[PDB]
């Protein structure tokens, strides 16, 4: 029979870039100065190459009563407040940012970066050397491709500030509506004409999450880039609202295999873009779905691919 934790397993010789999270979690030692001070000097460097993309207009709206404390704040009593989100200490700054989804919170460390600059709210100190692990950390994120970087900024990002409960209000971006069916264009995966996989594409890269989780089961999952399954259509469909709007997927190749009690797993690699750099950074993505008799999803799982020697072929 099958499970979530079992359907894990599936195209198990995938190669997942997992120096992703082991370089989050070598970042997650630093000390909160140079944590703040590796970001900076990371961004600085990725910004003579990359622009990222501006924040949406309700994005800076809804970090904006935040922003402007911060702003206020003498420039000691501001470090310490970026301390203390880095830390992830328990104050009401940080319980607000915790509320906050991804791109919220990336449009307001967005803002904090152009303030850095132009020298309104307190900078790295000048001429601040970063410890020997620190160093070390941001050597292996320059060494990283694109797509990898990118992933470790927004991980570093994400689980800074403090969570108190789970069913703490959650604020998210408004939810866009659904490409007019007349301009959305269709995808084209060599070897695969797979309904479900077909129109799981074309829904997501048209917003339309609504027609997206019916394509799942009841008690199907998704699991992003190194993270547990979302189970339930209810969390499943939470999760696109919130953080999956205006994404490009390119799929590009698959295969097809029978699996137990008529079953079928169906490994898709390809690329994606993100709404943050557009076609500047296109990462390396494996889908992996399997589906039940009926076609339905019960588990997809989102890898970013270790190097695009491990794109089929
Ligand atoms: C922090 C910080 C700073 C600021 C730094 C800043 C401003 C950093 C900002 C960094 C930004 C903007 C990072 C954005 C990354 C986006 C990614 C990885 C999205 C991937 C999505 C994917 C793969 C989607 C996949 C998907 C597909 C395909 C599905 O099929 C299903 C959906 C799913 C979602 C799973 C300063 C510079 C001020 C220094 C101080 C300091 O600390």
Redesign the pocket.
């Known amino acids: 029979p099958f499970t979530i934790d079992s359907a894990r397993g599936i195209f198990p010789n995938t190669l997942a870039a997992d120096v992703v999270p082991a370089t989050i979690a070598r970042f997650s030692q630093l000390n909160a100065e140079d944590?703040?001070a590796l970001?900076?000097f990371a961004?600085?460097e990725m910004g003579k190459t990359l622009t990222?993309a501006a924040p949406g207009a309700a994005s800076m709206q809804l970090a904006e009563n935040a922003l402007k404390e911060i702003q206020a704040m003498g420039p000691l009593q501001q470090t310490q407040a970026?301390c203390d989100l880095?830390n992830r200490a328990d104050t009401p700054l940080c319980r607000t940012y915790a509320s906050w989804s991804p791109n919220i919170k990336?449009g307001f460390?967005?803002r904090?970066?152009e303030l850095?600059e132009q020298g309104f709210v307190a900078p790295?100190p000048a001429g601040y050397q970063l410890s020997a692990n620190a160093n070390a950390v941001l050597a292996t994120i320059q060494g990283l491709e694109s797509?990898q970087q990118?992933?470790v900024?927004?991980n570093?990002?994400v689980d800074?500030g403090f969570t108190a409960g789970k069913d703490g209000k959650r604020i998210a971006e408004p939810v866009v509506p659904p490409q007019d069916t007349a301009s959305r264009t269709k995808v084209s995966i060599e070897g695969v004409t797979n309904a479900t996989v077909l129109n799981?594409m074309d829904n997501?890269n048209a917003n339309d999450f609504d027609t997206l989780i019916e394509l799942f089961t009841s008690d199907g999952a998704?699991q992003?880039?190194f993270q547990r399954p979302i189970v339930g259509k209810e969390n499943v469909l939470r999760?696109?609202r919130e953080?999956?709007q205006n994404?490009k997927?390119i799929p590009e190749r698959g295969v097809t295999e029978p699996a137990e009690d008529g079953f079928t797993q169906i490994k898709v690699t390809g690329k994606?873009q993100?709404p943050?750099?557009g076609g500047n950074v296109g990462?390396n993505?494996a889908?992996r779905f399997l589906l039940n008799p009926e076609g339905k999803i019960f588990f997809?799982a989102?890898d970013?691919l270790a190097s695009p020697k491990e794109l089929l072929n």
Do not use: H, N
Request: proline share 4%; net charge neutral; glycine share 4%.
């Open positions: 944590q703040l970001i900076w961004y600085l990222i970026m880095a990336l460390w967005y904090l970066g850095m790295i797509g990118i992933t900024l927004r570093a990002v800074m799981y997501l998704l992003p880039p999760f696109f953080e999956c994404l997927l994606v993100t943050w750099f990462m993505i889908w997809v989102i970013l």
